[PDB]
UniProtKB/Swiss-Prot annotation, chain B:
GO terms, biological process: regulation of apoptotic process; symbiont-mediated suppression of host apoptosis
UniProt similarity note: Belongs to the Bcl-2 family.
Cellular compartments per GO CC: host cell mitochondrion
First and last residues shown, out of full length: 6 to 142 of 175
Motif (BH1) on chain: 70-89
Role of this protein: Plays a role in the inhibition of host apoptosis by sequestering and inactivating multiple proapoptotic BCL-2 proteins, including BAK1 and BAX.
Motif (BH2): 96-110
Subcellular location: Host mitochondrion
Top-level taxonomy: Viruses, Varidnaviria, Bamfordvirae, Nucleocytoviricota, Pokkesviricetes
Name recorded for this polypeptide: Apoptosis regulator Bcl-2 homolog
Keywords, ordered alphabetically: Apoptosis, Host mitochondrion, Host-virus interaction, Inhibition of host apoptosis by viral BCL2-like protein, Modulation of host cell apoptosis by virus
Assembly: Interacts with host BAX; this interaction inhibits BAX oligomerization and subsequent activation. Interacts with host BAK1.
Domain of life: Viruses
Coiled-coil stretches: none
Length: 22, 132
């Protein structure tokens, strides 16, 4: 469903940009 | 099932969650203490940077395991493992229950149910040292 997907997208943003910087 | 790889994953995560909650050093109770220190430093950075957003997410009261499984639905990478552990550690302290292992078990299952061979091919936690 959507809200838990919207939350996951927020954490995936954090994760994927963290991965990019470091 | 709960084999060598399972416990390599579980006991790293559980000792980090214990340190985060108790502020006592736990690196000496894992086999891979060098990779533990990388995980710890990375989780600390993610929380320092994103705690306000974590608070807003947590205020919805949605089961943490529903969130974790969605984070890993499509792909895994070390950033996603770090961010899941940091989020769950943060959640575990704003709410002792973490000693029951449920959080660490859920993260471990979410990783290994779909990404077991990825994790082995990373040489277990050694792959996280790209962030050292």
């Amino acid at each position: 469903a959507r809200t838990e997907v919207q939350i996951a997208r927020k954490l995936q943003c954090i994760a994927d940009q963290f991965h990019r910087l470091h | 099932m709960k084999d060598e790889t399972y416990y390599i994953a579980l006991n790293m995560i559980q000792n980090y969650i214990i340190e985060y909650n108790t502020n006592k050093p736990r690196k000496s109770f894992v086999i891979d203490s060098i990779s533990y220190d990388v995980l710890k430093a990375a989780c600390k950075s993610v929380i320092k940077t994103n705690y306000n957003e974590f608070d807003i997410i947590i205020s919805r009261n949605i089961d943490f395991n529903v969130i974790v499984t969605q984070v890993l639905e499509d792909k895994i990478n070390w950033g996603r493992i770090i961010t899941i552990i940091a989020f769950c550690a943060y959640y575990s302290k704003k709410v002792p229950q973490y000693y029951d292992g449920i959080i660490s078990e859920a993260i471990t299952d979410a990783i290994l149910s779909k990404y077991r061979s990825w994790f082995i091919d990373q040489d277990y936690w050694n792959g996280i040292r790209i962030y050292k």
